[PDB]
């Protein structure tokens, strides 16, 4: 199933824990994309966040994936279920 | 260039049943052509709703505007357009 | 899979009464079936209002979308769909 | 009577850990009790979020208020309460 | 149990003038009964607007729902319902 | 003159807990006096929330302003004021 | 006693031009009377828009409501009312 | 040329008491001057709130900006600006 | 003086396409004059929408108002007006 | 391609005055350059607020993103981006 997911990032104002967090975040998203759950990843133009499409088998699968993100504590997340559009040409 | 585009459809209640049929028909045909040529890259429907949430791939704002204006549904659409940029953490195209 | 769904009903003023009642009976029959079959798990009325707050139990987004699209009221419904996940503190079944 | 209740959790950042685990534990234990007793009927979590969306079954507004006020999390919660009524087309029990 | 209720009235332009009078007269008579019986405890006009702020005293969400649905104005009302609880610092009656 | 007044209270986390309970006292004593004087006419709690929903009865806007401004909680309150008028259908 | 009042005008536009002028005229007639007498203290035009920002000077809420209720435009107005108080730092007239 | 201007004040809680009084005094002094000179035409307080709702009478946007920018309170203000125009039905002379 | 002005167009579905063609031609002619004269300095269309986002450069609020009031489209427009000011970091002319 | 861009500046109260003055100076220098090069076409101040309304002239979403991301003020900005299209009734 497909979900359109928007995330905005707000990291704390305060060390070099920062750069290990960011590398950890980037490493996690690499795996999820490679394995197929994180189908699409874009950056909203002018923003610190992403707009994504996830392809998973349950609400809980998506929930756990998001929860597992290093950034999660600092994320504002919106989840929107997507359905097949009858006029679609090709695959959803 | 990529745009995330949301369209909400509000067709008049007083549409002649036959006219409404052919409006839907030409809309479908128009979006078919745009998908075939690639400008309308992704087309989905928000679960529980009419309309669509889409991703367009065009060369300029003006090209997208013309395309959207060309849709038979345009007079009855509420459209939100949102520019998308490459994400450095992206793996793939 | 569970979804929390809010529906608000706005029937046109100028609806022909026969049909309007024919439409209401149809809505009621369609929802009776979906409840009997288990897809429409919970159905409550938002007090003070003409609509409902529901929990649907289906196996895909598209299954839900088709169900909502099949409602006689659909053209007059304002719908909000919220995906629900398991809460670790939950005792018993979701 | 039934209420749809949404709770959004905003735990203090830069608040000691051992303390934070104790708080979460007492919250978890508190909701278990209430779920066992039946006042906290349904408990879900909105996909992608930290909080819960729930349905409470109590005998009065005051009883609900006291229950919510009793939650270890209460000082860090944003809470929306929405009364639920019987829906004429309901098949089965509310 | 107490409820705070905002009601805002929106009559259509096309409403037949004679039907409008019947609508208003039946509405006033309905509210008179409910105030005399005591379920409709307080009623105030929202100054500058066609609506009211009210406090209802009923035994359940369901009883409130039926009352509100029963109002002739109902098809033209936007209604916000808010459950009220006893306040600790309260002196006197509610 | 009647006003519907909503107050949401947001005490600071850093606030010394004893002052929280002495501020809560001053506040409790003030509302008591105002209710006894008829100016704080009705006082309810919004279910599930830390705040009140009230009806005040005073002779002018400025009078309401001074009363609210005088509350020990004022600096921590989010306040919404709206006027109420007599309703012709009132019984 | 002062109220800041915002008004948005939304006329049907499906009406007789001379009828529109009759409604328009007596609205302006009603507002002339209220400004002369003093209840309608100040009156400005919201720029780019068909509406006004007013300050009313009135001795009760009921007096303000009756005044606004009485306006020829009332059925076609969206109104916001906001009580004003004296500012301790005010040097001149209110 | 008239502007309706709303200002909401949010002084920080960790303010040095002396500084707070200094701040409040200089703000008051600045506003006195602007009112005396006629730029700050009207100055009211929204009832129940800490801020002001004002009408400024200046010659240009730029003038208004620099005036607002120069308020000691500025870094703690939330400000809304709205141009006003002369209303044809205006009896009297703003 | 500069104003950022957004206009959203809501033509009724009631228009004789003769009349619609006419309104459009008229609106276009008026904006031409206003652009040539310099009051309508910039004019863009928001991508995907039937409106315009514009910068006007006029004498006063009263002037902007009259200009907007005068547009053939005015009865069908939703307009937002927002004053702009010289920016300190601006390189060259505003 | 044109973009209408709104930016709101939210400098934290605890911002080291030394850091604040540095940022202000470098932000100003950066906007000067981008205006001189032409990508930052129009810049106005919202009357009575600490921000700006700008029109940017660039070749892609990505170019705009990189520009906005490079602003010294970026970590403290609320930014709204709005694509602009040619208006048929435009004169000159
Ligand atoms: Cl991200
Ligand atoms: Cl569609
Ligand atoms: Cl329903
Ligand atoms: Cl929770
Ligand atoms: Cl009423
Ligand atoms: Cl309280
Ligand atoms: Cl007016
Ligand atoms: Cl002030
Ligand atoms: Cl236009
Ligand atoms: Cl800036």
């Amino acid at each position: 199933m497909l979900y359109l997911v928007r995330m905005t990032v707000n990291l704390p104002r305060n060390p070099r824990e920062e750069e290990r967090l960011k590398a950890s975040e980037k490493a996690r998203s690499r795996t999820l994309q490679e394995q197929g759950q994180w189908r699409y990843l874009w950056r909203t133009t002018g923003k610190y966040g992403n707009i994504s499409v996830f392809d998973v088998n349950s609400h809980d699968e998506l929930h756990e994936i998001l929860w597992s993100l290093p950034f999660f504590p600092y994320l504002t997340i919106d989840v929107e279920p997507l359905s097949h559009h009858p006029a679609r040409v090709g695959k959803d």
Side-chain angles (χ1 to χ4, degrees), chain A:
Chain A
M1 290 172 273
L2 299 182
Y3 300 76
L4 182 71
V5 175
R6 180 183 304 270
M7 313 182 205
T8 56
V9 187
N10 286 286
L11 303 175
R13 296 212 54 247
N14 36 264
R16 185 144 260 281
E17 220 285 271
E18 235 236 9
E19 289 311 319
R20 101 184 59 156
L21 181 78
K22 288 185 173 179
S24 195
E25 176 76 2
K26 179 167 174 173
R28 180 58 174 136
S29 68
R30 165 170 283 283
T31 303
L32 297 167
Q33 289 177 88
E34 284 176 340
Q35 282 184 323
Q37 291 79 22
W38 206 319
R39 176 181 293 195
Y40 299 130
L41 174 70
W42 305 290
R43 166 82 80 209
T44 328
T45 301
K47 297 266 178 193
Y48 190 10
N50 71 75
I51 177 88
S52 297
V53 173
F54 286 86
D55 177 19
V56 302
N57 302 307
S58 79
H59 298 344
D60 293 330
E61 188 175 350
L62 181 64
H63 177 80
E64 293 302 325
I65 287 180
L66 295 176
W67 199 266
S68 80
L69 301 182
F71 274 12
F72 184 75
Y74 316 116
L75 290 186
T76 305
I77 303 174
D78 294 316
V79 174
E80 177 184 337
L82 297 179
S83 279
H84 172 71
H85 195 299
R88 173 65 178 158
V89 169
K91 309 163 163 58
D92 293 337

